[PDB]
Amino acid sequence: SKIGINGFGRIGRLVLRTALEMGAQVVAVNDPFIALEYMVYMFKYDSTHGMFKGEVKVEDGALVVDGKKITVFNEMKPENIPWSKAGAEYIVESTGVFTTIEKASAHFKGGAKKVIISAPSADAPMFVCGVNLEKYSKDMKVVSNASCTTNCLAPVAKVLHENFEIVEGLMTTVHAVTATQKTVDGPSAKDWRGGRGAAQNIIPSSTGAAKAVGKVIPELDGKLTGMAFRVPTPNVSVVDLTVRLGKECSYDDIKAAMKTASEGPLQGVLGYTEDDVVSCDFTGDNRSSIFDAKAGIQLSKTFVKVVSWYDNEFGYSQRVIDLIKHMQKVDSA
Amino acid sequence: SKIGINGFGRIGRLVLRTALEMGAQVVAVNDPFIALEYMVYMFKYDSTHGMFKGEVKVEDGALVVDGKKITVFNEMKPENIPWSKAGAEYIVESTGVFTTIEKASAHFKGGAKKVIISAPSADAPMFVCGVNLEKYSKDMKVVSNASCTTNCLAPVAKVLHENFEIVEGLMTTVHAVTATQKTVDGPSAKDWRGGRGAAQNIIPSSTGAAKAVGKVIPELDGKLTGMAFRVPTPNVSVVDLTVRLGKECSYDDIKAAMKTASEGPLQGVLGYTEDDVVSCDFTGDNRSSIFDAKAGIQLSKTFVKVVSWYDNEFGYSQRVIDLIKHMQKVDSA
Amino acid sequence: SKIGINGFGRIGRLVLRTALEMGAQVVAVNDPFIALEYMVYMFKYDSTHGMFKGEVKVEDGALVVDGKKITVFNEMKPENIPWSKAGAEYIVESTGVFTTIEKASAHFKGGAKKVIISAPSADAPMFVCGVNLEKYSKDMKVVSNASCTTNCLAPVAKVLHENFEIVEGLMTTVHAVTATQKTVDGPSAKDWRGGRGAAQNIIPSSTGAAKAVGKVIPELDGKLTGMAFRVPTPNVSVVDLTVRLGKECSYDDIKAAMKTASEGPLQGVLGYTEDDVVSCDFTGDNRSSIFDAKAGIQLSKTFVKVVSWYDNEFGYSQRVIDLIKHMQKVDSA
Amino acid sequence: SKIGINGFGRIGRLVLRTALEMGAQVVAVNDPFIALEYMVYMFKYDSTHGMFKGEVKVEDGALVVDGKKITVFNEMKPENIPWSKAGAEYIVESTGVFTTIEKASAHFKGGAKKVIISAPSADAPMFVCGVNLEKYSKDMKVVSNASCTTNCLAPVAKVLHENFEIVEGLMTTVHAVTATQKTVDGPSAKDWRGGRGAAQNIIPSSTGAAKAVGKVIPELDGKLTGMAFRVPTPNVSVVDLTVRLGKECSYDDIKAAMKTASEGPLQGVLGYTEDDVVSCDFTGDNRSSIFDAKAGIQLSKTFVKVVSWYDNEFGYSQRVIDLIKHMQKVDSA
Numbered sequence A, B, C, D: 001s002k003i004g005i006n007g008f009g010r011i012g013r014l015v016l017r018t019a020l021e022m023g024a025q026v027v028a029v030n031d032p033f034i035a036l037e038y039m040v041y042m043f044k045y046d047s048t049h050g051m052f053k054g055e056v057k058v059e060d061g062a063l064v065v066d067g068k069k070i071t072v073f074n075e076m077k078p079e080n081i082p083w084s085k086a087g088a089e090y091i092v093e094s095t096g097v098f099t100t101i102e103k104a105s106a107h108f109k110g111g112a113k114k115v116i117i118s119a120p121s122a123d124a125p126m127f128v129c130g131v132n133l134e135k136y137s138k139d140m141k142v143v144s145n146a147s148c149t150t151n152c153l154a155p156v157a158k159v160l161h162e163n164f165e166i167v168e169g170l171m172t173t174v175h176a177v178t179a180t181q182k183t184v185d186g187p188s189a190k191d192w193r194g195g196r197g198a199a200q201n202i203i204p205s206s207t208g209a210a211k212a213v214g215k216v217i218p219e220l221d222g223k224l225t226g227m228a229f230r231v232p233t234p235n236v237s238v239v240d241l242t243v244r245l246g247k248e249c250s251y252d253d254i255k256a257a258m259k260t261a262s263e264g265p266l267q268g269v270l271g272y273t274e275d276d277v278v279s280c281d282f283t284g285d286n287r288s289s290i291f292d293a294k295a296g297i298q299l300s301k302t303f304v305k306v307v308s309w310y311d312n313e314f315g316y317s318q319r320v321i322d323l324i325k326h327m328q329k330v331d332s333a
């Protein structure tokens, strides 16, 4: 695997955590703003996902997790990280600032082989495991794993479209709070509503998720769009997709299609449930999106509303590894 | 006014509070489970709406608020409340148990003139101020003010329908917690999801709101339906209405229609805003529903999503008085 | 083990869950208000502690968990439960209503051998693993495991007293929300403050915890007392103990005493930490109380304030099994 | 009054808001990070304290509130603000960065007369209205209004000390979330626990409040100390003071002393209540600290625990004006 992670934020941290669980190998981490001792702390303890079981500790300027030695770098500019030295070939770009092919390339000058941007990109190829991985080729040096919401929407959209054809759809995502929000009314000049006390408000936000689905599933380009609502929950979000289908069908046909997909092609990616589940029943769930059968409702043979859950932090980080596994299987091939 | 209130819950209490503010006159209150001394307490202090300003106190088996003397009864069965004795003619049925014409009538044997059920009813005429009040006539002895959500949806639906015609619509309401939920995972045999910790979950719930709009606005019967999401906020909810219009139009045409309605026919009922508002900016707001101009988005000339806010507690209680005012203006006429 | 559980609430459920984990054997469960199908649901899903891993399912009027067959009864009166039939000898009384030796005895007429009340009792012997288990004898037919808070306080008090002697102490517990609180301002005639919206308030409550420590540790009887503060967190509480010691000492002497106890006599019961921990780092923690070294502060050689955490739900249920294990080791002895 | 405010954060904003209400005059405001149009927004809407009633609007590079014209500056360095130009003589330093006499003086080179630091200071004289104002003199050019917590503790300590003498005391403050906390686990290198998700944790923090009381009330210097607990509530905090008195007394003697003080010397500063109040019943309350009679408990004739509430944002901002009023009465004297 020889994986390298740039940035130790919610994603960076959780990806490393996911890696260890899933067996992937991380050899180096870079972050200029977080001391090595503070790293063992931020990694060991996680309010939402619990304390890391194994042993975490500093070991001669290196981070040691369950025996594994991860060398740590503190470079401010991506093109200074000596990736090659730590032997890191596949870099997970999770800083949120080097999201374009142009600037993401800096990592190459450090000895990096490939770069995976764990966020939407304006020009890098976007992928969603289970939806469009076949379009990947070794020659792609910089790719994007899209956003946590796109990863929830795309799977569901694909099944609906292939079976009944999506004519048009509007999406609303009731999202858990994000790290970019404020505990109390404060300054967010870029997003005014986003600066309002997160623990006391329902905050309307915007989202590119839907528009992005237009990139991973071309046929749907320009047929979907949506917005978000930020609510005071620490983790786990739900997608509310209202769509107009081209073919007439009963809600059962939809449930069937979903269930079938969930145990076949999209198994491990798209989940299916008929239980009376709630937000919390999905913390730590590693699927991209779980179809909530009982939650959705149908108005007419062609106008229906479906509901899909997703652990915005955990499921996404799991797909990041999956993407890298697939990439290496095709590359080292 | 000579108003009487049966039940001292969130609605009962807030209606009395609203009455005093708006000048209406409440002469009697009945509730078998709440001692007279506990009443001054539950009325004076309110976590969401603040401490009552005036003076509240017990005065010889009576409740005294700012000089006003409200006699208190403790009857368990509605047909035992001596309304006539306190001189109460218009009874606000807010217990939640006597919602049908059949059982709501009990109040008449006590000397009551008319009965207003502050909740949906299976057979009593449902009204929404600003939408269908002209359908009211003196001969109606028992009426319903629908639910807090119907009161938010109906106004918006009416404007949309009259201007562009609603072909079909699906509604989702991101609702604040209700008194029927649990602080932590507990027994809710009727609604399994409803018993899950309310402070930590996004709970999918059902709602008759949309179907009810089919009763107050006949033309829309069977063209709308929807569900809810319960989130951990103490008050104020938002309605997310995705609808397919019959006539083509631009989002501005919708904003215009709303703004126009808000300053004319529906003034005081439907509000309009273009500010970057959030959940809290509507606590204490006394309009049935406030159109959030910037929140909505349009996919096509006929497929749009509109967003409307409403203080599910306060706005509804204000409409309860309004309904009674209108009724008496037609009755004592 | 042959354990039986009466009541399927937060404690009843978690105890059964703990049992399975720890290997103890539960053979029967009784609860008149929860259908057998609703039981598999309430047991499988838990907002705070996650989804049960094993397989849970109804199997011919019985509850089956990971192969284990637990027969279910629906008796309303404790003296009708045919414990003997299911072969249940040690009953965990967790209903909260049969807490006195008098009424807890009902279980004996059903064939029960011993009864453990998972809550404070007015007359049944109270125990706290690690503190006074030596007082137990086979002849005791009905015992109490005190409350979740006593189990946190007692261990800490014992260590402090034995080493420096507690002259007097006042305790404050910042407690997570309880199942007896309200989501929004509602009727709590017994505890007026307790009926105020739990998600928006800091609610002062009372507690017998301290006074109870006077029963498990006689020498301290009448030297401790305290109150509580209910805050909007779903689980995990912290005990703030301010005490005046008889012997002079430095805060290190206290840390040492605690650390020593934690790895010796009270190992598994009292935990010790010097990390910058927070409420969540203890969800699922199975110790009765964890001493937070860095949190406490000392004013003088004899006036100090110590802080100890505890997962109010999980730690207590683990001690319930431990108590039964100890009892059987002495009984079947 | 001719007041000037530097910094438009929670304090800065609320002080201006308080000023208008109380009639004081603010002529200028400075803040380099908040655009003039964003100011009208952050001022008009406040999640916790509601929408400002009057009219707020931009008027030729100036902020206009209810007719009042407040000129706005955008200087980054305090010694560049042309205070004199706007005619601002008394500057309220609420940035949180220029808290020492040394750096707070920058304002003088801009034409400022006096400087009030709305936060603790390492070397500027600290005052608490009602406790030590008589210690102020015209020659003091830079003063501090202490912190929101000291203002709650000091009044209570003064009454207890004067009547029964405080031998030693340890204080714990269950504090609402602050603007310096994080919505989700993030980087707080200075305060590791402070970076943990504020909406899901009980976070132990430190506080100088008690030690500060040693400065405003010399006799108590070195006899008090304490810590804090940050809980997920948006506003209003409570102080838990455990103290050992020099004279023996009954809890009634304490209630009496408090009630007496509240209606006499400390009227308007120290409040008194015997109601079953909760966190929310104090939002908007403008007293420095409200003694909760029923919440406290007494162990012995000399060991008692008292509880006092305070709207950490609102009460403090009101005292800031009060301090300035007193200062000018002595200065312009």
Ligand SMILES: Nc1ncnc2c1ncn2[C@@H]1O[C@H](COP(=O)(O)OP(=O)(O)OC[C@H]2O[C@@H](O)[C@H](O)[C@@H]2O)[C@@H](O)[C@H]1O
Pocket (backbone or CB within 6 Å): A006, A007, A008, A009, A010, A011, A012, A013, A030, A031, A032, A033, A034, A075, A076, A077, A078, A094, A095, A096, A097, A177, A178, A179, A180, D184, D186, D187
């Ligand atoms: N030039 C840089 N080089 C390296 N690291 C950098 C640089 N600039 C910033 N960083 C690091 O990147 C991290 C930024 O990540 P976060 O802001 O903490 O968030 P992220 O990891 O991107 O996760 C964001 C996601 O998590 C959710 O909480 C949130 O809603 C969002 O969806 C920090 O730890 C920071 O030190």
Ligand SMILES: Nc1ncnc2c1ncn2[C@@H]1O[C@H](COP(=O)(O)OP(=O)(O)OC[C@H]2O[C@@H](O)[C@H](O)[C@@H]2O)[C@@H](O)[C@H]1O
Pocket (backbone or CB within 6 Å): B006, B007, B008, B009, B010, B011, B012, B013, B030, B031, B032, B033, B034, B075, B076, B077, B078, B094, B095, B096, B097, B148, B177, B178, B179, B180, C184, C186, C187
């Ligand atoms: N037979 C009866 N006769 C008279 N009063 C009765 C009877 N049965 C119950 N009551 C009283 O009626 C009240 C019921 O009201 P609540 O349950 O407190 O709620 P309600 O007033 O109906 O408001 C419900 C609304 O408030 C929100 O919190 C909630 O989500 C919902 O939208 C109680 O105080 C109760 O004593």
Ligand SMILES: Nc1ncnc2c1ncn2[C@@H]1O[C@H](COP(=O)(O)OP(=O)(O)OC[C@H]2O[C@@H](O)[C@H](O)[C@@H]2O)[C@@H](O)[C@H]1O
Pocket (backbone or CB within 6 Å): B184, B186, B187, C006, C007, C008, C009, C010, C011, C012, C030, C031, C032, C033, C034, C075, C076, C077, C078, C094, C095, C096, C097, C177, C178, C179, C180
């Ligand atoms: N007569 C009875 N016989 C048998 N079971 C009964 C009876 N009466 C009630 N029960 C059952 O007992 C259960 C009551 O438990 P809960 O109210 O859910 O609470 P408990 O199990 O006692 O746990 C309480 C603890 O959990 C925290 O949430 C709370 O703060 C407290 O510390 C219910 O499932 C109910 O059906």
Ligand SMILES: Nc1ncnc2c1ncn2[C@@H]1O[C@H](COP(=O)(O)OP(=O)(O)OC[C@H]2O[C@@H](O)[C@H](O)[C@@H]2O)[C@@H](O)[C@H]1O
Pocket (backbone or CB within 6 Å): A184, A186, A187, D006, D007, D008, D009, D010, D011, D012, D013, D030, D031, D032, D033, D034, D075, D076, D077, D078, D094, D095, D096, D097, D177, D178, D179, D180
């Ligand atoms: N050099 C400077 N000059 C002028 N203004 C400055 C400077 N540096 C920062 N500021 C401004 O000062 C403000 C800082 O205030 P906040 O951080 O928002 O908080 P404050 O006003 O100090 O109130 C803090 C209090 O409020 C609670 O939320 C919190 O718990 C704390 O007790 C910002 O709006 C910022 O633009």
